[PDB]
Amino acid sequence: MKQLTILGSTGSIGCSTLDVVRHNPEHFRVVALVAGKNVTRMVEQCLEFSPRYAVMDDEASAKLLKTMLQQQGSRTEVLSGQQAACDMAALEDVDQVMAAIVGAAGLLPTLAAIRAGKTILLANKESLVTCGRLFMDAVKQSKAQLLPVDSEHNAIFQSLPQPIQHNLGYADLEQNGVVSILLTGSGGPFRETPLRDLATMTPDQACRHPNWSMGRKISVDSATMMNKGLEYIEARWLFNASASQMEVLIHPQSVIHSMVRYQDGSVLAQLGEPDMRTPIAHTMAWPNRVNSGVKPLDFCKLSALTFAAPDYDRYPCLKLAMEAFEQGQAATTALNAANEITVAAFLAQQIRFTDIAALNLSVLEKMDMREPQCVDDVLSVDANAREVARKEVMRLAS
Amino acid sequence: MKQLTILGSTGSIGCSTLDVVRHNPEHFRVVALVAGKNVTRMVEQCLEFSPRYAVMDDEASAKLLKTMLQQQGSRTEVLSGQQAACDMAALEDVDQVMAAIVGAAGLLPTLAAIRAGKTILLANKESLVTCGRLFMDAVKQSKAQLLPVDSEHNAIFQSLPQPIQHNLGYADLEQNGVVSILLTGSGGPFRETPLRDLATMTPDQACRHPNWSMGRKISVDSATMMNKGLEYIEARWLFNASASQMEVLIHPQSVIHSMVRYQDGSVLAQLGEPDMRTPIAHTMAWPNRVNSGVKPLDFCKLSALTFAAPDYDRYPCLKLAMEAFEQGQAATTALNAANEITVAAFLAQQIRFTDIAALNLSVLEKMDMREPQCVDDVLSVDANAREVARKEVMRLAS
Ligand SMILES: NC(=O)C1=CN([C@@H]2O[C@H](COP(=O)(O)OP(=O)(O)OC[C@H]3O[C@@H](n4cnc5c(N)ncnc54)[C@H](OP(=O)(O)O)[C@@H]3O)[C@@H](O)[C@H]2O)C=CC1
Ligand SMILES: NC(=O)C1=CN([C@@H]2O[C@H](COP(=O)(O)OP(=O)(O)OC[C@H]3O[C@@H](n4cnc5c(N)ncnc54)[C@H](OP(=O)(O)O)[C@@H]3O)[C@@H](O)[C@H]2O)C=CC1
Numbered sequence A, B: 001m002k003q004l005t006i007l008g009s010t011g012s013i014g015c016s017t018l019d020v021v022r023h024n025p026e027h028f029r030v031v032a033l034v035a036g037k038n039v040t041r042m043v044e045q046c047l048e049f050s051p052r053y054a055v056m057d058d059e060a061s062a063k064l065l066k067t068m069l070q071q072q073g074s075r076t077e078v079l080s081g082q083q084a085a086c087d088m089a090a091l092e093d094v095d096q097v098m099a100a101i102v103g104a105a106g107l108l109p110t111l112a113a114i115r116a117g118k119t120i121l122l123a124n125k126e127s128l129v130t131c132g133r134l135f136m137d138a139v140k141q142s143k144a145q146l147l148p149v150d151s152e153h154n155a156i157f158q159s160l161p162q163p164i165q166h167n168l169g170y171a172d173l174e175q176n177g178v179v180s181i182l183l184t185g186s187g188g189p190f191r192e193t194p195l196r197d198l199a200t201m202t203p204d205q206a207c208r209h210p211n212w213s214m215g216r217k218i219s220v221d222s223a224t225m226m227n228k229g230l231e232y233i234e235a236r237w238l239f240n241a242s243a244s245q246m247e248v249l250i251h252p253q254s255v256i257h258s259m260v261r262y263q264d265g266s267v268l269a270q271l272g273e274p275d276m277r278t279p280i281a282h283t284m285a286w287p288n289r290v291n292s293g294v295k296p297l298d299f300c301k302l303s304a305l306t307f308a309a310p311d312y313d314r315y316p317c318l319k320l321a322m323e324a325f326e327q328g329q330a331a332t333t334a335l336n337a338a339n340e341i342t343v344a345a346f347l348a349q350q351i352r353f354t355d356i357a358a359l360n361l362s363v364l365e366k367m368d369m370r371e372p373q374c375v376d377d378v379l380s381v382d383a384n385a386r387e388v389a390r391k392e393v394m395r396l397a398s
């Protein structure tokens, strides 16, 4: 049996992860749950799975949680704060850490798991994007194995040969017959929206993905295709790919999750229902397999699968992220930090949908800072670009 | 470097194979070529690649070949007949044998390669279909590794995990997380032809595949979907799959070549241009990769990819083959033998297109014979069902 600490257990991926455990009691046991403010969800999960520990990031939420748990007679002890999260990710009995906190806030707890040599089920993409080579150095230095959870990177992982799978980010693609990595695809809920209508799209409209049920941040990133930009940066670190070995493709139907080109013409791909339990269960069981709760993909009830090239006028964010990689880690760290702030601003109805890409570009220009040489510098650049992002948000606020 | 005997070098797959060699002189060398009657093609290939030996099955064709070769000053020695083919497939210097003769005639030379412990690049599907468990017993008994060349079985092979790849036909699918094998797909050139028009389709119309350039036999089998029936039988032996672990799906566009379901919902698939150099080059280089001459599949210039369930009224042959597997090896051997005769009859304009499935059914009923216990019995059943098939052909001939 394998034992998990789940970071961000109350989110969409954390809930999908717990459902995989729920469908496989004899293979998986949850030792610790870690979240932020969602008390009702955490108390559902603590009473159900009886974890040893439960962390809420915010102190007042931990108090409410302990009151309900101690009333029912639960054995789950409640802690709080960032360091508690880091300690839960480094427990001796833990075999796997589902890194599924949203944004760069999940960096430090995820790095604690990596320093303790845990198997990292990596979903929290903003952490790798913002930390870059320093994240990959930390994994190599320790005894830790990265298993990508993100639909796209998991699909690519499953379509890569074993020398790559067993030396992720350090193996050579060309030596193993890989020409490029094909990153798909959805294109968001405003794919077919007229360009001049994009600015009037509300948060509720941006969070209604046709195929995916996700958190709010990641759903807005799907709409702007900043998600694909962040996954592009991430894929280059995860799979040791250069700009010329990367491709980006819109696939509206979200059936194909991503692909890998090979020298002989072959393209290996992962397919299935647009449902995160599948890739989550891939990593939890790898190199074996388990049932995830997802039913078999019925090919006779599908929409015709199409592909199209991404239009940078429709998706200014994609361009921002792809060029931020060429600009370096300071700009990338600054971009991700800015995108976190502007997406939050958009959801709070402070700015318009298309203001996300305008203000993101603005923050990047106003940032002038040295390339991070350590994790502290990564957080200093992140903190400083958030300050700038907030100022710009208020420059477009009613 | 690796050295090949190519069986059926002058056919469509043999030509595709030689083009892979042509694109990789430093990785591949042809020691021997083996064909039937196509003298102009064999003399092209002997003068180009300067093989040690060249076999033509028919004696008069070997004479014509030797005349031209000895005039130019070629070092290639010409032999003839079936035993010569078997000896070429068992030469000490040979590393790989491309089994690409059409029909059951390729059985014995392919079995010679298997007894000599060669790496079998298996394209000749009628040999495995007609020989069944006895073919798989011969491979296990020897030091031989099967690498499927057929578009579909190669795609499946590339989408299966390594324990299956390294113990093909003897490994357990369920233990390795495989739920089913998804076999696609094209549906032939008469897919959208009205049912009542099928009987007036000419040989020339049946050999015009939208996506594939193949030999005539295999193209008619695509039109009746007997090809998919033969690949269904073959897939069950190659990958140790039961009826419930097999699926059949029409995919008109021929972009996806076949897929594999997994327990967690995952479906791994191979994609690419409909071009046999790709899967051929997969096997020749495996587990490495080489260039095959096939360009990268442009996803932005594709037709929408559709899938549909096969209709047995449109494709009576598919039903015949799937049920012939339940009926045993004698019926399967008899069916394949009958289909060889009727497809030949159709191409020679002796019977109509839809007469293929009628006469195939007829032969099966009139056959009453014991299950083969050895290779000799397989050939006795094959020989006897050809006799019957010929009689039935003349019962519908003008
Ligand atoms: N959902 C999906 O289909 C996919 C998500 N991802 C990525 O995975 C990550 C998770 O996304 P998703 O689950 O959708 O986001 P959600 O908004 O649904 O949930 C995020 C989780 O993180 C927790 N969290 C936030 N801040 C902290 C903190 N500082 N300390 C500890 N926990 C915190 C939240 O707790 P709480 O809610 O209690 O406040 C919540 O449980 C993201 O980085 C996303 O980009 C990648 C591919 C797919
Ligand atoms: N073409 C394709 O895309 C695919 C083919 N296959 C299978 O692979 C095999 C090859 O098919 P394909 O190349 O299309 O067929 P072709 O008709 O194009 O060629 C068949 C080859 O076999 C040779 N041959 C026939 N009889 C004998 C004999 N008795 N002794 C030695 N050689 C002989 C022919 O020689 P000659 O022409 O000189 O008489 C020819 O070179 C078939 O079993 C087919 O089902 C499977 C998947 C795809």
Ligand SMILES: O=CN(O)CCCP(=O)(O)O
Residues within 6 Å of the ligand: A150, A151, A152, A184, A185, A186, A187, A188, A212, A221, A222, A223, A227, A228
């Ligand atoms: O894992 C899932 N994602 O990454 C979100 C996919 C939606 P997109 O393809 O529009 O980014």
Ligand SMILES: O=CN(O)CCCP(=O)(O)O
Residues within 6 Å of the ligand: B150, B151, B152, B184, B185, B186, B187, B188, B212, B221, B222, B223, B227, B228
């Ligand atoms: O390798 C190629 N084939 O098997 C022929 C494919 C055409 P079909 O899918 O119609 O059988």
